């Protein structure tokens, strides 16, 4: 089972925090039939939707962890099951989503019966898409702690985060990196079934 009725209602109310006509980036880590990290980002307000999912196929996950996202699967055991379907079900009707390489996003959305959502494929080159990568992690690394493993290429590389990807691709297309305080749309008790409280220093 997934979200309770009150979680669904809380989620429906939280989605009103998105502007259904504003620019909205989306990115995922993992394959579209088996995603482990999902992010949606509205640069205009700073609002973002960001959550995690436990993988079905461990073998593919462990390859993605080594070559892409660096996520330790044990850190996904406490995620809310069914959240991916509930968030996508809840997205505003006929909203427009921007992505870098729309194919994976499109397959995800279509698998959930959301063909009404229009996609904008930004099609940045590899190097252009990551031109603000280091700056984006430095400004915003506190927003995602889930990329704990070392990630390699065909040489070590900075892990890929669906949320950092949205921020840096928007900056690359906008032609600079804004100073904006971002804000999580989903409550933390929705993202994780059991969650660590804020650290008391
Ligand atoms: Mg990406
Ligand atoms: Zn991340």
Curated annotation (Swiss-Prot):
Changing residue 104 to A: Loss of RNase activity. It comes from the Viruses. Mn(2+) binds at residues 27, 29, 165. Zn(2+) binds at residues 37, 144, 147, 161. It is found in: Virion; Host cytoplasm. The record marks 104 as: Important for exonuclease activity. The N-terminal region is important for the cap-binding activity while the C-terminal region contains the 3'-5' exoribonuclease activity. A CCHE zinc binding site is present in the C-terminal region and may thus contribute to the substrate binding and/or the specificity of the exonuclease activity. Belongs to the arenaviridae nucleocapsid protein family. Encapsidates the genome, protecting it from nucleases. The encapsidated genomic RNA is termed the nucleocapsid (NC). Serves as template for viral transcription and replication. The increased presence of protein N in host cell does not seem to trigger the switch from transcription to replication as observed in other negative strain RNA viruses. Homomultimerizes to form the nucleocapsid. Binds to viral genomic RNA. Interacts with glycoprotein G2. Interacts with protein Z; this interaction probably directs the encapsidated genome to budding sites. Interacts with protein L; this interaction does not interfere with Z-L interaction. Interacts with host IKBKE (via Protein kinase domain); the interaction inhibits IKBKE kinase activity. This is Nucleoprotein. It comes from Lassa virus (strain Mouse/Sierra Leone/Josiah/1976) (LASV). The gene is N.
